[PDB]
Amino acid sequence: MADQLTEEQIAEFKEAFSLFDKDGDGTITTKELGTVMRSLGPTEAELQDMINEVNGTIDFPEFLTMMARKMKDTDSEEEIREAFRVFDKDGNGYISAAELRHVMTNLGEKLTDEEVDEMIREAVNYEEFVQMMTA
Fold first, then answer.
1. Per the annotation, does 21 bind a ligand?
2. Is the distance from CB of 86 to CB of 65 less than 8 angstroms?
3. Residue 115 belongs to domain with CATH number
């Protein structure tokens, strides 16, 4: 979904897309698409794959959908690690197991006590626990 990209990222992508291309239609050549992607801040193989995925004309929603998959993963991983490690103040990232289970059962969402016990039995660093729960 396109809702993963923030408003600032969408605005910057639109600004670069409009600045690279001249006045007229938003269609941009595949080589020009790669040049604009390089000007916006990837490998040659990734650029070729993105050009083949999207004649030779690329419009704005196509560029947004292509960049969302590349910008979502690392940002989500970093945000998850930072948010999981934000509770404890020790700085090491490995909080108490009982405290982590109590925080997961009391705050977060709506889950039964049996489900929390099963998740604790299936499960300690915060980022490691988040990555294990995501998988």
1. yes
2. no
3. 1.10.238.10
Confirm whether residue 113 is marked as ligand binding.
no
Structural domain of residue 104, as residue ranges? 85-134
Experimentally determined by: cryo-EM
Record the resolution, in angstroms.
Answer: 4.2
6 appears as a binding residue in the annotation: no
Specify whether 94 is located in the same domain as 50.
no
55 is in an annotated binding site: yes
Q: Determine whether 130 is exposed, middle or buried from the number of CB atoms within 10 Å of its CB (0-12, 13-18, 19+).
A: middle
User: In sequence order, which ranges of the chain are alpha helices (DSSP H)?
Assistant: 7-20, 30-39, 44-53, 60-84, 97-106, 113-122, 126-134
What is the rounded CA–CA span in Å between residue 34 and residue 5? 20
115 marked as part of a ligand binding site: no
Q: Which residues contact 100 (CB under 8 A, 6 or more apart)?
A: 124, 126, 129
Do 7 and 66 share a domain, yes or no? yes
Binding site annotation covers 73?
no
Do 21 and 52 meet the contact criterion of CB atoms below 8 Å apart?
A: no
Residue 80 within any structural domain of the chain: no
69 and 6 within one domain: yes
DSSP state of 21: S
Q: Is position 23 annotated in a ligand binding site?
A: yes
